[PDB]
Design a protein around this motif. Structure first.
Motif, PDB file in Angstrom:
ATOM      1  N   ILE A  31       5.059   3.892   2.128  1.00 41.24           N
ATOM      2  CA  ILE A  31       4.882   2.559   1.820  1.00 41.24           C
ATOM      3  C   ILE A  31       4.423   1.760   2.735  1.00 41.24           C
ATOM      4  CG2 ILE A  31       5.459   0.627   0.076  1.00 41.24           C
ATOM      5  CD1 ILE A  31       6.694   2.684  -1.740  1.00 41.24           C
ATOM      6  N   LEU A  32       3.644   0.766   2.791  1.00 38.62           N
ATOM      7  CA  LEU A  32       3.221  -0.144   4.006  1.00 38.62           C
ATOM      8  C   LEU A  32       3.097  -1.436   3.054  1.00 38.62           C
ATOM      9  CD1 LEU A  32       0.186   1.262   5.903  1.00 38.62           C
ATOM     10  CD2 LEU A  32       2.520   1.826   6.270  1.00 38.62           C
ATOM     11  N   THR A  33       3.335  -2.700   3.915  1.00 43.04           N
ATOM     12  CA  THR A  33       3.235  -4.096   3.596  1.00 43.04           C
ATOM     13  C   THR A  33       2.345  -4.434   4.625  1.00 43.04           C
ATOM     14  OG1 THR A  33       5.248  -4.319   2.098  1.00 43.04           O
ATOM     15  CG2 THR A  33       4.040  -6.347   3.066  1.00 43.04           C
ATOM     16  N   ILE A  34       1.179  -5.207   4.191  1.00 41.19           N
ATOM     17  CA  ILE A  34       0.247  -5.815   5.191  1.00 41.19           C
ATOM     18  C   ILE A  34       0.233  -7.193   4.980  1.00 41.19           C
ATOM     19  CG2 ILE A  34      -2.160  -5.516   6.284  1.00 41.19           C
ATOM     20  CD1 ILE A  34      -2.449  -2.923   4.522  1.00 41.19           C
ATOM     21  N   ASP A  35       0.822  -8.030   5.942  1.00 45.05           N
ATOM     22  CA  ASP A  35       1.013  -9.444   5.826  1.00 45.05           C
ATOM     23  C   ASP A  35       0.050 -10.069   6.873  1.00 45.05           C
ATOM     24  OD1 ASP A  35       1.803 -12.129   5.267  1.00 45.05           O
ATOM     25  OD2 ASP A  35       3.806 -11.744   5.677  1.00 45.05           O
ATOM     26  N   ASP A  36      -1.109 -10.668   6.509  1.00 46.16           N
ATOM     27  CA  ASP A  36      -2.101 -11.312   7.426  1.00 46.16           C
ATOM     28  C   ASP A  36      -2.474 -10.408   8.749  1.00 46.16           C
ATOM     29  N   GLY A  37      -2.975  -8.980   8.516  1.00 45.02           N
ATOM     30  CA  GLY A  37      -2.997  -8.245   9.436  1.00 45.02           C
ATOM     31  C   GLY A  37      -1.778  -7.579  10.056  1.00 45.02           C
ATOM     32  N   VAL A  88       0.835  -1.196   0.070  1.00 41.02           N
ATOM     33  CA  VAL A  88       0.150  -0.021   0.180  1.00 41.02           C
ATOM     34  C   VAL A  88       0.874   1.213   0.130  1.00 41.02           C
ATOM     35  CG1 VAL A  88      -1.910   0.918   1.387  1.00 41.02           C
ATOM     36  CG2 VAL A  88      -1.629  -1.324   1.285  1.00 41.02           C
ATOM     37  N   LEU A  89       0.597   2.258  -0.822  1.00 40.76           N
ATOM     38  CA  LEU A  89       1.221   3.387  -0.781  1.00 40.76           C
ATOM     39  C   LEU A  89       0.360   4.347  -0.351  1.00 40.76           C
ATOM     40  CD1 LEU A  89       3.628   4.805  -3.357  1.00 40.76           C
ATOM     41  CD2 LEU A  89       1.490   6.236  -2.666  1.00 40.76           C
ATOM     42  N   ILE A  90       0.576   5.256   0.600  1.00 42.71           N
ATOM     43  CA  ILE A  90      -0.236   6.311   1.277  1.00 42.71           C
ATOM     44  C   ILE A  90       0.448   7.668   0.760  1.00 42.71           C
ATOM     45  CG2 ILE A  90      -1.022   7.362   3.291  1.00 42.71           C
ATOM     46  CD1 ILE A  90      -0.201   3.857   3.130  1.00 42.71           C
ATOM     47  N   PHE A  91      -0.355   8.519  -0.104  1.00 46.79           N
ATOM     48  CA  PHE A  91      -0.044   9.829  -0.503  1.00 46.79           C
ATOM     49  C   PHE A  91      -0.830  10.965   0.391  1.00 46.79           C
ATOM     50  CE2 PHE A  91       1.630  12.307  -4.415  1.00 46.79           C
ATOM     51  CZ  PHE A  91       0.940  13.336  -4.299  1.00 46.79           C
ATOM     52  N   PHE A 100       1.342   8.609 -13.188  1.00 52.83           N
ATOM     53  CA  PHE A 100       2.640   8.099 -12.677  1.00 52.83           C
ATOM     54  C   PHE A 100       2.385   6.587 -12.398  1.00 52.83           C
ATOM     55  CE2 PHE A 100       5.580   7.013  -9.406  1.00 52.83           C
ATOM     56  CZ  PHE A 100       6.827   7.369  -9.692  1.00 52.83           C
ATOM     57  N   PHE A 101       1.118   6.195 -11.867  1.00 53.98           N
ATOM     58  CA  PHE A 101       0.904   4.866 -11.822  1.00 53.98           C
ATOM     59  C   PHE A 101      -0.075   4.093 -12.720  1.00 53.98           C
ATOM     60  CE2 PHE A 101       2.343   5.746  -7.350  1.00 53.98           C
ATOM     61  CZ  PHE A 101       2.955   4.289  -7.092  1.00 53.98           C
ATOM     62  N   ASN A 102       0.371   4.495 -14.026  1.00 54.05           N
ATOM     63  CA  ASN A 102      -0.079   3.881 -15.143  1.00 54.05           C
ATOM     64  C   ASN A 102      -1.622   3.775 -15.329  1.00 54.05           C
ATOM     65  OD1 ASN A 102       2.392   1.896 -14.155  1.00 54.05           O
ATOM     66  ND2 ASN A 102       2.885   3.407 -16.208  1.00 54.05           N
ATOM     67  N   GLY A 103      -2.434   4.795 -14.934  1.00 54.10           N
ATOM     68  CA  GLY A 103      -3.891   5.176 -14.986  1.00 54.10           C
ATOM     69  C   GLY A 103      -4.716   4.447 -13.831  1.00 54.10           C
ATOM     70  N   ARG A 104      -4.269   3.938 -12.826  1.00 49.62           N
ATOM     71  CA  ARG A 104      -4.673   3.288 -11.654  1.00 49.62           C
ATOM     72  C   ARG A 104      -5.570   3.918 -10.939  1.00 49.62           C
ATOM     73  NH1 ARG A 104      -1.697  -0.253  -8.308  1.00 49.62           N
ATOM     74  NH2 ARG A 104       0.272  -0.302  -9.737  1.00 49.62           N
ATOM     75  N   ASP A 105      -6.890   3.251 -10.462  1.00 52.66           N
ATOM     76  CA  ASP A 105      -7.779   4.053  -9.510  1.00 52.66           C
ATOM     77  C   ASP A 105      -7.261   4.133  -8.240  1.00 52.66           C
ATOM     78  OD1 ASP A 105     -10.136   3.492 -11.382  1.00 52.66           O
ATOM     79  OD2 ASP A 105     -10.590   1.537 -10.479  1.00 52.66           O
ATOM     80  N   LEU A 106      -7.788   5.264  -7.553  1.00 53.72           N
ATOM     81  CA  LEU A 106      -7.104   5.841  -6.356  1.00 53.72           C
ATOM     82  C   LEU A 106      -8.316   5.688  -5.165  1.00 53.72           C
ATOM     83  CD1 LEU A 106      -5.701   9.488  -7.447  1.00 53.72           C
ATOM     84  CD2 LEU A 106      -4.435   7.303  -7.140  1.00 53.72           C
ATOM     85  N   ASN A 107      -7.741   5.317  -3.903  1.00 53.96           N
ATOM     86  CA  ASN A 107      -8.797   5.130  -2.665  1.00 53.96           C
ATOM     87  C   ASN A 107      -8.898   6.625  -2.452  1.00 53.96           C
ATOM     88  OD1 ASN A 107      -9.433   2.192  -2.281  1.00 53.96           O
ATOM     89  ND2 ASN A 107      -7.242   2.259  -2.763  1.00 53.96           N
ATOM     90  N   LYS A 108     -10.158   7.170  -2.593  1.00 50.90           N
ATOM     91  CA  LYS A 108     -10.209   8.585  -2.278  1.00 50.90           C
ATOM     92  C   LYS A 108     -11.823   8.691  -1.725  1.00 50.90           C
ATOM     93  CE  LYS A 108     -11.369   9.869  -7.028  1.00 50.90           C
ATOM     94  NZ  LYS A 108     -11.197  10.816  -7.964  1.00 50.90           N
ATOM     95  N   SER A 109     -12.696   7.809  -1.619  1.00 55.98           N
ATOM     96  CA  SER A 109     -14.051   7.944  -1.177  1.00 55.98           C
ATOM     97  C   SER A 109     -14.372   8.224   0.378  1.00 55.98           C
ATOM     98  CB  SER A 109     -14.905   6.615  -1.511  1.00 55.98           C
ATOM     99  OG  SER A 109     -14.157   5.525  -0.670  1.00 55.98           O
ATOM    100  N   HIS A 153      -0.186  -2.553  -4.527  1.00 54.38           N
ATOM    101  CA  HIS A 153      -1.800  -3.087  -4.788  1.00 54.38           C
ATOM    102  C   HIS A 153      -2.595  -2.033  -4.510  1.00 54.38           C
ATOM    103  CE1 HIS A 153      -0.402  -7.253  -4.419  1.00 54.38           C
ATOM    104  NE2 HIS A 153       0.747  -6.659  -3.474  1.00 54.38           N
ATOM    105  N   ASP A 154      -2.429  -1.132  -3.548  1.00 53.28           N
ATOM    106  CA  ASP A 154      -3.531   0.185  -3.405  1.00 53.28           C
ATOM    107  C   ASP A 154      -2.625   1.662  -3.144  1.00 53.28           C
ATOM    108  OD1 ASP A 154      -5.478  -2.201  -2.806  1.00 53.28           O
ATOM    109  OD2 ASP A 154      -4.158  -2.337  -0.898  1.00 53.28           O
ATOM    110  N   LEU A 155      -3.457   2.453  -3.639  1.00 54.20           N
ATOM    111  CA  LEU A 155      -2.916   3.992  -3.654  1.00 54.20           C
ATOM    112  C   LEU A 155      -4.096   4.592  -2.741  1.00 54.20           C
ATOM    113  CD1 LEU A 155      -1.926   4.397  -7.205  1.00 54.20           C
ATOM    114  CD2 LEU A 155      -0.517   4.015  -5.500  1.00 54.20           C
ATOM    115  N   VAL A 156      -3.698   5.090  -1.467  1.00 57.50           N
ATOM    116  CA  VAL A 156      -4.482   5.874  -0.697  1.00 57.50           C
ATOM    117  C   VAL A 156      -4.262   7.306  -0.677  1.00 57.50           C
ATOM    118  CG1 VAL A 156      -5.602   5.734   1.575  1.00 57.50           C
ATOM    119  CG2 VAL A 156      -4.932   3.773   0.669  1.00 57.50           C
TER     120      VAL A 156
END
Ligand SMILES: Nc1ncnc2c1nc(Cl)n2[C@@H]1O[C@H](CO)[C@@H](O)[C@H]1O
Length: 385
Positions: A209-215, A195-198, A353-362, A332-335
């Motif tokens: 940048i975070l890695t989430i491995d089984d919680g 996960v990348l948090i901007f 920059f992330f080649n047209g990726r969806d952003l988590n912004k809801s 995997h995820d952009l926040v």
């Protein structure tokens, strides 16, 4: 009742936010002025101490006794080059008490000095009272967030601010971790998730940048600019309007402190409008020498004025990817976090920059951290029973 209740607090550099998880949903709590975020400002006047909006609203009249940026000092030694560099830009006095900085002010006609944790505890007390007014009962259990790069001394001074404020601090959690929790990114089952948090706020920019491995959360990289945020974009608008006033009236307003401040607050408001409209209008009665300033600006011109600043947000993104040893396709995820991430050009630059990726912004980006902290505070208080 109160013992089974817990709040999540985002203790920010410029703004703070408080949330509560109840009845299956997070409620971001509005303050007494109806605002979902509260300025991290503390004003000391001739009769009272002001916290939040009321403190930010009188900053022009009382700059020597209006404290802000306490998070830049918290957990640091006076001699720290970060402290020495920052002190040159604050209108309040910073003194040295045995290699520890204290902010020195005039309060009720007397000279008083406060540790950064005492200043932050006044901000925390206000967030605690905002939650209590919403809930109808005192709440004392809290999760407080800090930047992922804060060391042990900064985390300990933040917990101390919580204690002074009358809060039982359940945990000090990283801001990007709270944001990933807000989006439920730790509940995707098995396998490592990158996960990348901007996070682009009012005065700071952080990439995590975070890695989430089984919680389990792991910080792979942190990058950014501690002196880049929404206030630099407001200042680029100010410079434009100062030059436009000079072209229309042949008068330089830059030296009139009142004219510059009224222009600055109007620019900040116009900047926000430009996130949902393609133009914004400025309406300032008698800006300078009785001259009204009624003008407008397109989103295209605003994007040109901040172009170099928006583009500069991509160097820490690349730097964080290289430090984490990850390619773009491995994320995997952009926040999005911070009010400034609402700017369409910023979203377009990050998405391309992330080649047209969806952003988590809801989730309201200036509220996502408090949202996650509130979720964690509910899980933690339930396990405490
Ligand atoms: N709609 C918006 N469009 C652009 N900038 C915004 C917006 N909302 C906020 Cl808050 N900010 C800015 O975010 C910071 C607080 O997180 C402040 O600089 C504020 O102006």
């Amino acid at each position: 009742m109160a013992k089974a209740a817990a709040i999540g607090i985002d203790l920010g550099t410029t703004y703070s936010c408080v949330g509560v998880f109840q009845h299956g949903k997070v409620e971001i709590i509005a303050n007494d002025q109806g605002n979902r975020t509260t300025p991290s400002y503390v004003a000391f006047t001739d009769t009272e101490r002001l916290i939040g909006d009321a403190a930010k609203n009188q900053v022009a009249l009382n700059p020597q006794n209006t404290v802000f940026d306490a998070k830049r000092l918290i957990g640091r030694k006076f001699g720290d080059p970060v402290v020495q560099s920052d002190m040159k830009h604050w209108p309040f006095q910073v003194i040295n008490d045995g290699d520890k900085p204290k902010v020195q002010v005039s309060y009720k006609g007397e000279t008083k000095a406060f540790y950064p944790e005492e200043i932050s505890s006044m901000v925390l007390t206000k967030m605690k009272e905002i939650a209590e007014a919403y809930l109808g009962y005192p709440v004392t259990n809290a999760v407080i967030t800090v930047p992922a790069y804060f060391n042990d001394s900064q985390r300990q001074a933040t917990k101390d601010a919580g204690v002074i404020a009358g809060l039982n601090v359940l945990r000090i959690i990283n801001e990007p971790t709270a944001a990933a929790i807000a989006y439920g990114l730790d509940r995707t089952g098995k396998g490592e998730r990158n996960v990348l948090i901007f996070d682009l706020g009012g005065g700071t920019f952080d990439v995590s940048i975070l890695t989430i491995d089984d919680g389990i959360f792991e910080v792979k990289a942190t990058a950014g600019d501690t002196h880049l945020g929404g206030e630099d974009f407001d200042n680029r608008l100010v410079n434009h309007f100062v030059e436009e006033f000079k072209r229309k009236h042949k008068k330089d307003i830059s030296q009139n402190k009142r004219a510059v401040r009224r222009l600055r607050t109007a620019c900040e408001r116009a900047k926000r409008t430009l996130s949902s409209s393609t133009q914004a209008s400025l309406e300032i009665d008698s800006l300078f020498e009785g001259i009204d300033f009624y003008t407008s600006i397109t989103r295209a011109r605003f994007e040109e004025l901040c172009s170099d600043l928006f583009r500069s947000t991509l160097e820490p993104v690349e730097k964080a990817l290289r430090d984490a040893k990850l390619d773009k396709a491995q994320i995997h995820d952009l926040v999005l976090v911070g009010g400034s991430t609402r700017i369409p050009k910023v979203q377009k630059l990050l998405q391309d920059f992330f080649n047209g990726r969806d952003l988590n912004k809801s989730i309201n980006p200036d509220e996502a951290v408090a949202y996650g902290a509130a979720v964690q505070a509910a899980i933690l208080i339930k396990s405490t029973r």
